[PDB]
Design a binder for this molecule. Structure first.
Ligand SMILES: CN(Cc1cccc(Cl)c1)C(=O)Cn1nnc2ccccc21
Ligand SMILES: CN(Cc1cccc(Cl)c1)C(=O)Cn1nnc2ccccc21
Lengths: 304, 304
């Protein structure tokens, strides 16, 4: 027992990290097979930042201007192309450490691990959620661009995120591995509105089930609710409206604990209306929304 | 910016994990050079659990009874020995993936990453602190024994923990890599008192400095305190007494923010006496003590 904000083991992704330098800028790249993927803003300089013309900036660059180094070994670049906001640098050597992998676009509310890197070297790994407004609340410093987010399903790494930017508000924005931003963001150094965010209701309910499994039960009550009534409370407290699809995804946890989903909703309703009264749930004094129902079952069953 | 409970990249440790089976029991082992380390309770059966006679149980075992498998490859055991609560199985092949490593005994209040494993396969990685009472609040299920805790200093893995037991209270106990338990615990299925725990004051102060660095400043006040006065408050709230050695370790963070350590102590004193007033610090509604001053600087500087 016990419940922690667990990240996937990062080894398979560490083997893919490289450093990419173009001119004066250095960031991280992801080397899979014979292609290195990195943020296209590696081609920008300090003046280019407010509104770069990426097509023009890339036309001034040749294969030999992209310096790619895998630890201490230099990679030979034999092609380059921009796809949305990523650059794809074709190299003459397939990464011998390429794991089985997929590129996936994750949905808002889903979770993933981030391997924060600097100069192609891994610094740390943490788990987070893609917010409903398509930002992530990560831990990134200058030089972390090109660090990736991923999930692992047995031996397959599904890459879902590449880091590109820290908005002036201190929240993070990035793209899928085809270079499409999550959310309305653009790769320019400008203030950009991130929409209104909400709390991921289905994840808070999953985490209350994790709490019951792991012995924290004080919040269980004698009440029940309906989806309609619960959604009036979710509206008031800026929580995502709960749907039958969310109730269905919570089925396994409901069966494992014997607590009907709407009864757990009534516990969540009372916690939203009354707060925690200075008590904690799984070591937290707030309602946690960064664990999906799949994460809770995975952590509570021991999946490798 | 941003601050997360970051674990070290786990790749170097994933390469060392193996499965060890003796009789009916399977747990994890750590393969470094030509030795596999694992908890000695791999030799116990269901009857042996209340008070195993480990010397007698091990005398019934031969090298060929220890089944060690590295992924899918079987290791040949050419020697076995018990050192405190660990078994050391000498194998005929040095692990080709052995990183540069050390065995260290960590101090209470220090932090480390855990790579949770089942059947020799990594499941997830998380960061935690060794509590002042020598327990850890981890996330472990049956089969996780032999999972290890570690820190990484550039290319060197310092292994500090091997998991052995979940106490009836749901907290975790284990040993250094020489098999010495942290705390008063013994490897038997009995209720065992874990001492009175305290909150790691120097880590809470380090985390308040991380909060100021990362923009959360609301808790800063117009006050100062002394070590003596602060320690009366620490006593009341079950916090570790602060010493000049702790103030010295906080020197770098104090210099980076320009906030004198005793002024930060006055902010911590007001938070202890008044609570958070329904506000948060770095996404937490409680005072966090699982980040050391070294962790905060490492995360805020980008060390790889
Ligand atoms: C370089 N820019 C802005 C930007 C992004 C895209 C294109 C352009 Cl042309 C300019 C960043 O925001 C890089 N960044 N990403 N995470 C960070 C964390 C802390 C400090 C900086 C960080
Ligand atoms: C087998 N024992 C008890 C024990 C420990 C040492 C020696 C003996 Cl003889 C018996 C455990 O506590 C193993 N364990 N460790 N973490 C766990 C998490 C959840 C469930 C079980 C877990």
């Amino acid at each position: 027992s016990g419940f922690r904000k667990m990240a996937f083991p990062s080894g398979k992704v560490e083997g893919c990290m490289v450093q990419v330098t173009c001119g004066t800028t250095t960031l991280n790249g992801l080397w899979l097979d014979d292609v290195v993927y990195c943020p296209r803003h590696v081609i920008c300089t300090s003046e280019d930042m407010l509104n770069p013309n990426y097509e023009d900036l890339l036309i001034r660059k040749s294969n030999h201007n992209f310096l790619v180094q895998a630890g201490n070994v230099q990679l030979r670049v034999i092609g380059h192309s921009m796809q949305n906001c990523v650059l794809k640098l074709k190299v003459d050597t397939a990464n011998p450490k390429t794991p089985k992998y997929k590129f996936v676009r994750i949905q808002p509310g889903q979770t993933f691990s981030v391997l924060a890197c600097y100069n192609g070297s891994p610094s740390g790994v943490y788990q987070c959620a893609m917010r409903p407004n398509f930002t992530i609340k990560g831990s990134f410093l200058n030089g972390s661009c090109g660090s990736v987010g991923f999930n692992i399903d047995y031996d397959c790494v599904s890459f879902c995120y590449m880091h590109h930017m820290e908005l002036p508000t201190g929240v993070h924005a990035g793209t899928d591995l085809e270079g499409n931003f999550y959310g309305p963001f653009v790769d320019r150094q400008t203030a950009q509105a991130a929409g209104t965010d909400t709390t991921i209701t289905v994840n808070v309910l999953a985490w209350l089930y994790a709490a019951v499994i792991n012995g924290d039960r004080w919040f269980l009550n004698r009440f029940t609710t309906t989806l309609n009534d619960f959604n009036l409370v979710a509206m008031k407290y800026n929580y995502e409206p709960l749907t039958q699809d969310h109730v269905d995804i919570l089925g396994p946890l409901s069966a494992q604990t014997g607590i009907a989903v709407l009864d757990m909703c009534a516990s969540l309703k009372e916690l939203l209306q009354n707060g925690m009264n200075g008590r904690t749930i799984l070591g937290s004094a707030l309602l946690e929304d960064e664990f999906t129902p799949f994460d809770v079952v995975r952590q509570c069953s021991g999946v490798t």
